[PDB]
Amino acid sequence: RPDLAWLDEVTMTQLERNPYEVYERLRAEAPLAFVPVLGSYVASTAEVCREVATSPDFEAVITPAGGRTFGHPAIIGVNGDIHADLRSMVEPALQPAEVDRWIDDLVRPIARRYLERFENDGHAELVAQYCEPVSVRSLGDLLGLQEVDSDKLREWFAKLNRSSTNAAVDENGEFANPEGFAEGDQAKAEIRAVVDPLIDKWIEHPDDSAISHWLHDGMPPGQTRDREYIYPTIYVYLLGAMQEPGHGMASTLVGLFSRPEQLEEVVDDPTLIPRAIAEGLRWTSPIWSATARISTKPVTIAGVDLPAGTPVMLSYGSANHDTGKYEAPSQYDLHRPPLPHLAFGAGNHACAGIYFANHVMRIALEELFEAIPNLERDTREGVEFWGWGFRGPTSLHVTWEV
Ligand code: HEM
Ligand SMILES: COc1ccccc1O
């Protein structure tokens, strides 16, 4: 496409460091555009992302690096009967009435435990000391991975992140950094060594762990889902489900710190925490551009005639800065009107864990502000954000008097 020749010079490092300048141009120039270093069409605006995610002429496809990382059948990459079965598999513990039965007793003692380790120090790096541990320990316990330490869960989602977003391709469309998948393979081998004996046990002795229910629910007597059939969805969880609520709470805190009067409002009135998080997710979307759909017939989207078989990456992080919808979207603003956003995606493959994730983030921020009402950002330290596929702050140094 001749007028987009500047896209040939966009690098993967640029998109990882900060994709918003490139995507601001894409939203204006070409809401559906082929990005050479990604080797794919990308949808950058809210209208195009929603249309593709809900269109009957598209179905899910995994990103190239995502497929190399997760294999088949990852819940994000399949359709039809297999997708219906995997949704029925994961949905029970995520049902809102079910989450409401136990979410407080799950997350609140976890939040307290991590807080107790540092709440009197006067300094902390909240990503590693709080946001990521609460996110992974909550979900890990729900899944049946109580004995997998939070350090290890955090290391796994970071390796799976890097592997599944190792998207750069060369002049020939081949992966430019094939090495980059080796740490995803290593994380999967470690996961197998830990989880295979738990599956061995759950097959014979089912319990209330989510993974035991994935093996047993809906199955004929004495049968279980084959472990090779469920492992790719286990990996999907050990990446995003483990990583995202922590990144969402952290981005929300960075946003609030950028608006000190709003931080004070939310600390004074914790009923505003859900609104603060919704704006945080729009402002820096944790799943920024990690999923995709593929056309199943020829289709015209945003003026582009696509053949059947065309993948389109859904860059929901960019769609959530669409200036067709939002005023000054790069600014965090608690008092933005509560409008629809795309940080949980859309359509048949939209996020299955929204209600759970929102409560995990809410309870974590409730307990943080409670414990440390005079929390302030350490302004001697910069907050970098990193990531094109998944995006979040790499640290969040804070301070408080005591
Ligand atoms: C703030 C935290 C989270 C955010 C921002 C988020 C966002 C998303 C997004 C954008 C997608 C892809 C949707 C699409 O392609 O249209 C997704 C898919 C998914 N998410 Fe969430 N997620 C979060 C937490 C979680 C958690 C904690 C769980 C599980 C407990 C979860 C389970 C899933 C599942 C199973 C899918 C795949 C749905 C499918 O393909 O049918 N998510 N999520
Ligand atoms: C819930 O985890 C994911 C969602 C979308 C893409 C990759 C994931 O691991």
Numbering used by the authors: 6 to 407
What's written in the study?
A broader survey of variants at the GcoA-F169 position (amino acids S, H, V, I, and L in addition to A) confirmed that GcoA-F169A exhibits the best catalytic performance in terms of both specific activity and reaction coupling, although other small side chains (S and V) also permitted reactivity with syringol, suggesting that these may permit syringol to assume a reactive conformation at the heme. Each protein variant also crystallized successfully with guaiacol and the structures showed that the orientation of the bound ligand remained consistent with that of the WT enzyme.
Our recent characterization of a two-component P450 enzyme system consisting of a reductase, GcoB, and a P450 oxidase, GcoA, demonstrated that it demethylates diverse aromatic compounds, including guaiacol (which can be derived from coniferyl alcohol and represents the aromatic functionality of G-lignin that must undergo demethylation), guaethol, anisole (methoxybenzene), 2-methylanisole, and 3-methoxycatechol (3MC) with similar or greater efficiency than other O-aryl-demethylases described in the literature. In the present study, we hypothesized that substitution of GcoA-F169, which has the closest interaction with the bound substrate, may relax the specificity of the enzyme sufficiently to permit the O-demethylation of S-lignin type substrates.
